[PDB]
Design a protein around this ligand. Structure first.
Ligand code: JR5
Length: 116
């Protein structure tokens, strides 16, 4: 509260580390469904069903332009990519399984990087 400061983790490397994690995502074999926005003009239902589209290129642009205030908001957008994928694609379709694979890949990099 006012004048009662809680010790806070050092956040000075967060931008560089989130960029490194995002680069590992972008170069993963199964990143191809997520590198670019889903084409809202070619995919029936997507714009209507998926209220907040998100993809790696948009995350990369936002990271490169100061649009993430903290690392938690970055992880929210990454997770949004895979939540969208799981809403729209069957679990064992190629895109659907890619999404499950990429979520697991991400969460392990996240804990390995930022949990101690
Ligand atoms: C995440 N998500 N969820 C759904 C879809 C997708 N991703 C796509 O659409 C991506 C986005 C841009 C193009 N493509 S692509 O067609 O898949 C593609 C990508 C690389 C490549 F070399 C060949 C084809 C579509 C149906 C629902």
């Amino acid at each position: 509260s006012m004048s009662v400061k809680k010790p806070k983790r050092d956040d000075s490397k967060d931008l560089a580390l989130c960029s490194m994690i995002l680069t590992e995502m972008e170069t993963h074999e199964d990143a191809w469904p997520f590198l670019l926005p889903v084409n809202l003009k070619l995919v029936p239902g997507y714009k209507k069903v998926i209220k907040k589209p998100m993809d790696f290129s948009t995350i990369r642009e936002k990271l490169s332009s100061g649009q993430y205030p903290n690392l938690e908001t970055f992880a929210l957008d990454v997770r949004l990519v895979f939540d969208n994928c799981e809403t729209f694609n069957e679990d064992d379709s190629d895109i659907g399984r890619a999404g499950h694979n990429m979520r697991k890949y991400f969460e392990k990099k996240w804990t390995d990087t930022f949990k101690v």
